[PDB]
Amino acid sequence: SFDQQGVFVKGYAMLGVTGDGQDEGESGFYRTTFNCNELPTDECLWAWQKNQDIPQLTSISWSPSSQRTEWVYVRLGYDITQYNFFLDQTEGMTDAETLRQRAEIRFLRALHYWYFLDLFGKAPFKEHFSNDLPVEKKGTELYTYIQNELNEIEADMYEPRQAPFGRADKAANWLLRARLYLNAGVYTGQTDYAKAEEYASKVIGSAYKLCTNYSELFMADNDENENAMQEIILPIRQDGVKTRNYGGSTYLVCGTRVAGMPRMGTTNGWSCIFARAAMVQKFFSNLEDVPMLPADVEIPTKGLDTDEQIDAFDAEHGIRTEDMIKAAGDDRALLYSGVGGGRRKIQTDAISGFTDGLSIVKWQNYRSDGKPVSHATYPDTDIPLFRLAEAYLTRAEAIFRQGGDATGDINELRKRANCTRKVQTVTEQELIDEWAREFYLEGRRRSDLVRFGMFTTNKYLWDWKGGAMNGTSVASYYNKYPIPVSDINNNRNMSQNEGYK
Ligand SMILES: [Ca+2]
C-alpha cells in the first residue's frame, strides 16, 4: 500500500543519495547537477581526462550523445515522476501535515524544473504520474509555471526556521523565486531585477542569519552547530553511516582529496577535482602572490607521514591552508598548495593529474566542536544547498543592475569572511568574482556565468576553457545543454536545442 510518510521522506532523500557504466552514486541529483554546473567552468577541473565525456564537459564541447548530460536529464525527470506520484496519491487530503507535505513536494518539483530550465532552457513536462509521454514546456512558459507553483504553495509552508531541519520553509520558497527573478532575463528575455530585490529582501528580513565563521557551513556538524544552521535555508542531510558512499558530500570531500594531504577527513581520497588557475585568481588577482613552495626547494621522501610533520613543513614554507587564508585576506580561500600529496602547480600546460592545480579544502569531514564523526570514510557533512548568503549576493546584483548602490550587501559577505579588502564601488567583474568566492564548488557557477554572458564568450577566458590551455571561446549554443539523443529518439514530443546536430 501507499506509504505516505515513506514516499515523502524519499522525496527529500532524492536530493542527497542514490538507491551500468556509472559508478556508485553517479546518477545522483547532486553530483549530476553539480558537474554540469562546475566541470566546464572556471572553478575546477576533473583530473582524469581519460574518463568518458570528461574532456567534453571540461572544454564545453559535448554533443547530444553526452553521457553526463543524459545522466542529469534522466535524474531530474525521474525525481519529478516521484513527486507527481506523491501528489496524485495525496490529492484531496486536508489534514495539516499533508498540506505542508504537498506544498513542500511541489517546492521540490519546482526546484527540479528550475534545473531543467537553467540547464536545458526547457523540460519534459508532466504534472501527473501516468504512462503518457511528457510534453515539451519551453522557457517562458516553464518560467511562468515555476513562479506560479511557488506563489500558490507559499501559504501552506512552514514559517522561516520552523520546519524540521532538512525541510523547506517559506524562506526557501522566496529564495528560489529571487533566483528565478534574477535570471528572468536569461529565461524569458525580460529582466525582473525589481522582484529579485524584493524577494531577496524577504529572505534577509527573516529569522535566518549569517554564520560568523564561513568554514563552519561546510563542516561535519553543520546540522547541529547553530552558528551554521542559522544560515542554512535548505540543507541536504547527509550521514556517513547511512548515506555512505552514495551521497553528494561523499563527492565533495573524497573527490577533492588525495592520500598525503593533512586532515583528509576520509580514508579514501578520490583525487577527482582541483582548482583551475582562474579559481585561485579569484582570491589572488596576481597569481605570483599565491603562497607556493619554491621549485628549488626539494620535498623530502621521508618524515612527512603524519599531519604534524606535514603541517610543520608547510608552516616553514608558508603553505599551510591557514597561511593561504592569511595571504588572501579572506576566510573563504580554503585552498591547499602544501606538500601533502605532492608538489602542486597553480596552472598546467597539460591536464595530467590531480596535482596539476591547487586543492580545494572548503568541504570538510571534521566537526567544529571537535567531536567524532560517524564514519572513517564517508562524510557526515550536510550540503547547505540554500544559504542566506545567496539572498545578499542576489540583492546586490539586482540593485547594481538597476543602477543602485550594492556596496552594502557585498560588504556584508566580505565582512563575514573577515576580508582585509572592502569594496568601495561595485562593478560587473566584482560581482561575478564575488559569486565565485562565496559559492565556489556549491554547484551553481555555470548558471551565474551564463547570466553574465561569460560562459561561452570572449568576455571571460579561463584556463582550459574551450580546450585551449589559456582558454578560448566556444559556440554560443553551448549556453544550454542538448536534449539527450536517447530522449529525442524515445519522445517525439521533444525537440533538440539550437546548434546541436
Ligand atoms: Ca550530517
XYZ file of C-alpha atoms and ligand atoms in Angstrom:
502
model
C 0.000 0.000 0.000
C 0.961 3.666 -0.383
C 3.247 4.673 2.486
C 2.721 8.444 2.511
C 5.437 9.080 5.100
C 7.906 6.803 3.331
C 7.316 8.397 -0.057
C 7.556 11.899 1.440
C 10.878 11.031 3.076
C 12.129 9.618 -0.233
C 11.109 12.846 -1.943
C 13.712 14.707 0.084
C 16.193 11.815 0.141
C 16.478 12.018 -3.646
C 18.343 15.303 -3.228
C 21.226 13.662 -1.411
C 21.511 9.962 -2.197
C 21.009 7.279 -4.848
C 19.366 3.883 -4.489
C 25.738 0.259 -15.811
C 28.780 2.236 -16.937
C 28.069 4.515 -13.997
C 29.922 4.246 -10.664
C 28.283 4.253 -7.220
C 26.099 7.310 -6.693
C 26.923 8.715 -10.133
C 23.238 9.113 -11.061
C 22.716 11.310 -8.018
C 20.752 14.538 -8.257
C 23.558 16.482 -6.618
C 26.567 15.020 -8.433
C 24.987 15.234 -11.893
C 23.736 18.805 -11.462
C 26.952 19.855 -9.719
C 29.129 18.501 -12.527
C 27.094 20.145 -15.276
C 27.376 23.473 -13.432
C 31.027 23.086 -12.320
C 33.244 20.901 -14.526
C 33.011 23.202 -17.587
C 33.600 26.346 -15.516
C 36.500 28.376 -14.148
C 36.161 26.840 -10.695
C 37.546 23.343 -11.130
C 38.959 20.587 -13.313
C 38.450 16.823 -13.385
C 41.974 15.395 -13.056
C 41.423 12.233 -15.119
C 40.680 13.302 -18.689
C 40.669 9.701 -19.956
C 37.265 9.204 -18.313
C 34.321 9.142 -20.721
C 32.735 12.508 -21.558
C 35.129 14.358 -19.242
C 37.067 16.131 -21.995
C 33.698 17.249 -23.382
C 32.393 18.683 -20.115
C 35.809 20.145 -19.286
C 36.124 22.052 -22.570
C 32.448 22.810 -23.286
C 32.483 20.591 -26.381
C 29.802 17.976 -25.684
C 27.195 16.647 -28.111
C 23.659 15.219 -27.792
C 25.273 11.835 -27.114
C 26.817 13.222 -23.916
C 26.684 10.654 -21.127
C 26.934 13.264 -18.354
C 24.099 15.239 -19.942
C 21.873 12.172 -20.203
C 22.583 11.383 -16.543
C 21.354 14.724 -15.210
C 18.395 14.789 -17.612
C 17.210 11.310 -16.608
C 17.691 12.060 -12.907
C 15.741 15.328 -12.921
C 12.862 13.708 -14.789
C 12.791 10.630 -12.565
C 12.679 12.698 -9.375
C 9.728 14.631 -10.765
C 7.795 11.458 -11.609
C 8.089 10.533 -7.927
C 6.900 13.966 -6.783
C 3.948 13.659 -9.156
C 3.135 10.229 -7.741
C 3.055 11.566 -4.184
C 0.836 14.482 -5.223
C -1.604 12.254 -7.110
C -1.848 9.833 -4.182
C -2.491 12.529 -1.576
C -4.932 14.509 -3.700
C -7.929 15.622 -1.657
C -6.310 15.177 1.757
C -6.914 18.108 4.085
C -5.001 17.298 7.286
C -2.413 19.897 8.340
C 0.711 17.779 7.846
C -0.367 16.636 4.388
C -0.958 20.245 3.342
C 2.612 21.029 4.390
C 3.938 17.879 2.707
C 2.187 18.627 -0.585
C 3.464 22.211 -0.567
C 6.993 21.003 0.127
C 6.833 18.327 -2.578
C 5.581 20.936 -5.065
C 8.505 23.097 -3.942
C 10.962 20.290 -4.673
C 9.307 19.677 -8.043
C 9.576 23.394 -8.790
C 13.270 23.301 -7.880
C 13.791 20.399 -10.285
C 12.004 22.261 -13.067
C 14.284 25.231 -12.411
C 17.267 22.975 -13.087
C 15.636 21.847 -16.337
C 15.024 25.476 -17.269
C 18.502 26.624 -16.293
C 20.362 23.724 -17.915
C 18.254 22.958 -20.991
C 16.008 26.011 -21.359
C 13.017 23.669 -21.451
C 11.813 20.419 -19.920
C 9.874 17.181 -20.475
C 6.698 18.308 -18.735
C 4.201 16.221 -16.770
C 2.155 17.113 -13.718
C 0.651 13.702 -13.029
C 2.054 10.181 -12.726
C 0.997 8.287 -15.855
C 2.292 6.479 -18.940
C 1.667 9.421 -21.267
C 4.836 10.838 -22.818
C 5.843 14.199 -21.324
C 5.101 17.287 -23.413
C 7.682 19.994 -24.049
C 7.307 23.123 -21.924
C 9.607 25.842 -23.282
C 11.413 28.630 -21.449
C 8.944 31.458 -20.792
C 6.027 29.074 -20.229
C 8.200 26.957 -17.938
C 9.406 30.051 -16.075
C 5.833 31.212 -15.528
C 4.799 27.754 -14.343
C 7.558 27.556 -11.738
C 6.825 31.050 -10.408
C 3.118 30.213 -10.176
C 3.817 26.960 -8.335
C 5.929 28.728 -5.717
C 3.378 31.516 -5.366
C 0.460 29.130 -4.830
C 2.175 26.919 -2.242
C 3.774 29.587 -0.029
C 0.803 29.832 2.337
C 0.938 26.132 3.278
C 4.658 26.071 4.082
C 6.321 26.425 7.488
C 7.338 29.916 8.594
C 11.111 30.588 8.371
C 13.126 28.173 10.542
C 10.015 26.461 11.895
C 10.249 23.327 9.760
C 12.194 20.247 10.862
C 15.818 20.780 9.804
C 16.111 19.373 6.293
C 12.713 20.576 5.110
C 11.817 23.630 3.027
C 10.035 26.616 4.567
C 8.683 29.913 3.223
C 12.200 31.379 3.056
C 13.365 28.563 0.774
C 10.369 29.444 -1.395
C 11.286 33.134 -1.514
C 14.956 32.447 -2.222
C 14.196 30.232 -5.209
C 11.818 32.873 -6.544
C 14.531 35.501 -6.083
C 16.907 33.284 -8.066
C 14.273 32.916 -10.790
C 13.628 36.655 -10.943
C 17.377 37.360 -11.092
C 17.638 35.035 -14.103
C 14.360 36.166 -15.695
C 16.271 37.891 -18.486
C 18.008 34.668 -19.479
C 14.878 32.520 -19.294
C 12.263 34.915 -20.715
C 14.223 37.671 -22.428
C 12.689 40.144 -19.993
C 14.523 41.050 -16.787
C 12.807 41.452 -13.419
C 15.524 42.649 -11.056
C 12.958 44.665 -9.114
C 11.302 41.438 -7.957
C 14.665 39.742 -7.410
C 15.445 42.512 -4.932
C 12.022 42.244 -3.285
C 12.165 38.513 -2.601
C 15.832 38.595 -1.647
C 14.819 41.200 0.948
C 12.046 38.964 2.265
C 14.670 36.295 2.948
C 17.106 38.754 4.532
C 14.294 40.035 6.736
C 13.559 36.531 8.044
C 14.852 34.703 11.133
C 17.829 33.394 9.143
C 21.216 34.981 9.895
C 24.790 34.679 8.603
C 27.174 32.166 10.162
C 30.045 34.050 11.846
C 32.628 31.502 10.648
C 32.387 30.694 6.939
C 34.245 27.378 7.144
C 31.729 26.004 9.651
C 28.995 25.985 6.983
C 30.844 23.148 5.250
C 31.884 21.047 8.240
C 30.654 17.704 9.594
C 28.479 19.179 12.344
C 26.639 21.722 10.192
C 23.364 20.043 11.204
C 23.996 20.628 14.932
C 26.111 23.804 15.150
C 23.646 26.689 15.493
C 26.193 29.132 14.065
C 25.898 27.255 10.781
C 22.250 26.174 10.991
C 21.015 29.751 11.297
C 22.125 30.426 7.704
C 21.204 27.130 6.059
C 17.792 27.619 4.460
C 17.771 24.227 2.745
C 20.201 21.531 3.848
C 20.605 18.223 2.050
C 21.041 15.966 5.077
C 23.965 13.537 4.893
C 25.192 10.964 7.434
C 28.367 8.931 6.958
C 26.965 5.660 8.283
C 23.625 5.985 6.452
C 24.335 7.908 3.228
C 27.684 6.141 2.958
C 29.392 6.185 -0.455
C 26.288 7.208 -2.417
C 25.803 10.781 -1.240
C 26.585 14.238 -2.518
C 29.075 15.220 0.167
C 30.905 11.941 -0.432
C 31.984 13.510 -3.710
C 32.628 16.972 -2.289
C 35.001 15.655 0.382
C 36.544 12.488 -1.068
C 36.592 13.906 -4.576
C 38.798 16.846 -3.576
C 41.359 14.922 -1.530
C 44.328 12.635 -2.200
C 46.463 10.491 0.097
C 49.143 12.552 1.810
C 47.083 15.687 2.398
C 46.796 16.736 6.047
C 43.356 16.341 7.649
C 41.782 14.458 4.760
C 38.701 13.644 6.819
C 38.491 10.325 4.981
C 40.474 7.157 4.338
C 39.692 7.406 0.632
C 40.825 10.410 -1.385
C 39.455 10.083 -4.921
C 41.645 12.912 -6.259
C 38.917 13.826 -8.785
C 38.789 17.614 -8.893
C 41.082 20.519 -8.129
C 41.008 24.287 -8.637
C 41.673 25.842 -12.030
C 44.173 28.694 -12.017
C 41.281 31.075 -12.662
C 39.646 29.963 -9.394
C 42.786 30.714 -7.407
C 42.927 34.108 -9.090
C 39.572 34.978 -7.521
C 41.482 35.293 -4.242
C 44.822 36.410 -5.711
C 44.461 38.786 -8.663
C 48.223 38.441 -9.110
C 48.975 34.719 -9.030
C 52.561 35.486 -8.035
C 51.208 36.385 -4.584
C 49.878 32.869 -4.010
C 51.870 31.041 -1.306
C 53.883 28.375 -3.118
C 56.842 26.117 -2.418
C 59.873 27.273 -4.432
C 60.839 24.996 -7.321
C 64.378 24.855 -5.916
C 63.159 23.506 -2.568
C 63.014 19.712 -2.554
C 60.266 17.699 -0.896
C 61.663 15.007 1.453
C 60.747 11.408 0.616
C 60.698 10.631 4.344
C 59.461 12.293 7.518
C 56.140 13.516 6.117
C 53.706 10.754 7.080
C 51.792 12.455 9.891
C 49.691 15.617 9.750
C 52.066 17.082 12.333
C 55.117 16.599 10.101
C 53.289 17.851 7.010
C 51.934 20.906 8.843
C 55.354 21.818 10.243
C 56.958 21.637 6.801
C 54.128 23.643 5.240
C 54.447 26.162 8.082
C 58.176 26.537 7.470
C 57.457 27.412 3.835
C 54.272 29.378 4.482
C 51.987 26.989 2.635
C 49.511 25.678 5.203
C 45.917 26.393 4.232
C 45.772 28.823 7.156
C 48.732 30.606 5.554
C 46.829 30.653 2.248
C 43.926 32.335 4.045
C 46.189 34.878 5.732
C 47.842 35.764 2.417
C 44.469 36.092 0.673
C 42.999 38.181 3.467
C 39.789 36.180 3.055
C 38.457 33.331 5.243
C 36.988 31.769 2.095
C 40.367 30.995 0.491
C 40.187 27.340 1.555
C 42.825 26.129 -0.898
C 45.915 23.987 -0.379
C 49.321 24.386 -2.041
C 51.240 22.474 0.625
C 53.406 19.384 0.156
C 50.873 16.817 1.344
C 50.049 14.736 -1.713
C 52.919 16.060 -3.804
C 54.232 19.237 -5.407
C 51.346 21.354 -6.704
C 51.075 23.668 -9.711
C 48.715 26.633 -9.962
C 48.457 26.303 -13.743
C 49.394 23.441 -16.080
C 50.270 23.074 -19.774
C 48.519 19.700 -19.882
C 45.900 18.124 -17.607
C 47.825 15.037 -16.499
C 46.910 14.609 -12.850
C 45.420 15.800 -9.562
C 48.471 17.841 -8.554
C 48.260 19.999 -11.688
C 46.256 22.532 -9.705
C 45.728 23.629 -6.108
C 43.469 21.502 -3.943
C 40.136 22.790 -2.677
C 39.588 22.032 1.008
C 36.377 24.017 1.516
C 34.339 20.895 2.275
C 35.481 19.077 5.408
C 34.541 15.952 7.311
C 35.580 17.404 10.683
C 33.219 18.856 13.283
C 33.644 22.420 14.516
C 33.156 21.085 18.049
C 35.944 18.535 17.650
C 33.757 15.526 18.427
C 33.906 12.216 16.499
C 32.214 11.834 13.111
C 30.178 8.708 12.299
C 32.470 7.105 9.731
C 36.150 6.893 8.809
C 35.455 7.036 5.080
C 32.022 8.509 4.302
C 31.374 12.123 5.439
C 28.689 13.466 7.771
C 28.790 16.903 6.169
C 25.406 18.173 5.000
C 25.217 20.190 1.790
C 23.834 23.672 2.543
C 22.070 23.813 -0.831
C 20.312 27.087 0.033
C 22.223 29.651 2.136
C 21.207 33.123 3.332
C 24.336 34.433 1.608
C 22.585 33.874 -1.730
C 19.986 36.499 -0.802
C 22.692 39.106 -0.166
C 24.514 38.442 -3.446
C 21.235 38.255 -5.368
C 20.052 41.559 -3.933
C 23.463 43.122 -4.563
C 23.381 42.121 -8.225
C 19.740 43.181 -8.604
C 20.430 46.593 -7.070
C 23.551 47.010 -9.199
C 21.661 46.114 -12.391
C 19.059 48.776 -11.558
C 21.670 51.490 -11.079
C 21.643 51.451 -7.288
C 24.336 51.125 -4.613
C 25.149 47.466 -3.915
C 28.270 48.003 -1.792
C 26.382 47.304 1.427
C 25.205 43.817 0.514
C 28.552 42.800 -0.971
C 30.431 44.013 2.091
C 28.035 42.111 4.345
C 29.574 38.940 2.944
C 33.127 40.271 2.807
C 32.857 41.366 6.456
C 31.595 37.919 7.446
C 34.625 36.446 5.676
C 36.889 38.854 7.579
C 38.182 40.313 4.310
C 41.013 42.815 4.503
C 39.802 44.421 1.265
C 36.344 46.012 1.255
C 34.560 47.067 -1.929
C 34.212 50.815 -2.478
C 32.344 50.590 -5.787
C 30.582 47.584 -7.302
C 31.246 46.552 -10.904
C 30.135 43.671 -13.118
C 33.503 41.947 -12.688
C 33.488 42.395 -8.907
C 30.050 40.773 -8.708
C 30.809 37.652 -10.739
C 34.096 37.283 -8.840
C 32.249 37.502 -5.519
C 29.785 34.844 -6.694
C 32.815 32.592 -7.146
C 34.476 33.482 -3.837
C 31.269 32.909 -1.884
C 29.799 29.910 -3.690
C 32.636 28.045 -5.423
C 32.064 24.280 -5.501
C 28.415 24.629 -4.500
C 27.031 23.718 -7.931
C 25.814 26.991 -9.435
C 28.813 28.532 -11.228
C 27.733 27.879 -14.822
C 24.321 29.450 -14.247
C 25.873 32.682 -12.994
C 28.408 32.730 -15.844
C 25.621 32.376 -18.428
C 23.657 35.239 -16.866
C 26.759 37.448 -17.077
C 27.275 36.329 -20.676
C 30.668 34.862 -19.807
C 30.152 31.105 -20.090
C 30.795 30.698 -23.820
C 32.058 34.119 -24.947
C 35.357 36.019 -25.003
C 34.030 38.256 -22.250
C 35.892 35.883 -19.915
C 38.564 33.328 -20.807
C 39.862 30.991 -18.095
C 42.418 28.185 -18.264
C 41.302 25.183 -20.339
C 38.083 26.828 -21.480
C 37.211 25.659 -24.979
C 40.001 23.092 -24.858
C 42.798 25.667 -25.018
C 45.309 25.823 -22.176
C 44.939 29.612 -21.882
C 41.250 29.487 -22.746
C 39.283 30.132 -25.919
C 35.605 30.754 -26.703
C 33.042 28.240 -27.956
C 29.751 28.440 -29.869
C 27.017 30.395 -28.083
C 24.570 27.492 -28.364
C 26.571 25.804 -25.616
C 24.826 28.033 -23.067
C 22.223 25.276 -22.997
C 22.890 21.566 -22.738
C 21.460 19.450 -25.564
C 18.462 17.202 -25.060
C 19.922 13.679 -24.749
C 19.680 11.966 -28.133
C 18.169 8.996 -26.301
C 15.121 11.037 -25.288
C 14.954 12.679 -28.712
C 14.527 9.184 -30.144
C 12.206 7.985 -27.377
C 9.959 11.048 -27.053
C 8.792 12.524 -30.356
C 7.331 15.410 -28.338
C 10.806 16.747 -27.574
C 12.878 18.894 -29.928
C 16.655 19.388 -29.884
C 18.120 22.721 -28.757
C 19.602 25.118 -31.327
C 23.111 24.437 -32.612
C 23.314 20.731 -31.850
C 23.066 18.041 -34.524
Ca 25.036 15.461 8.509
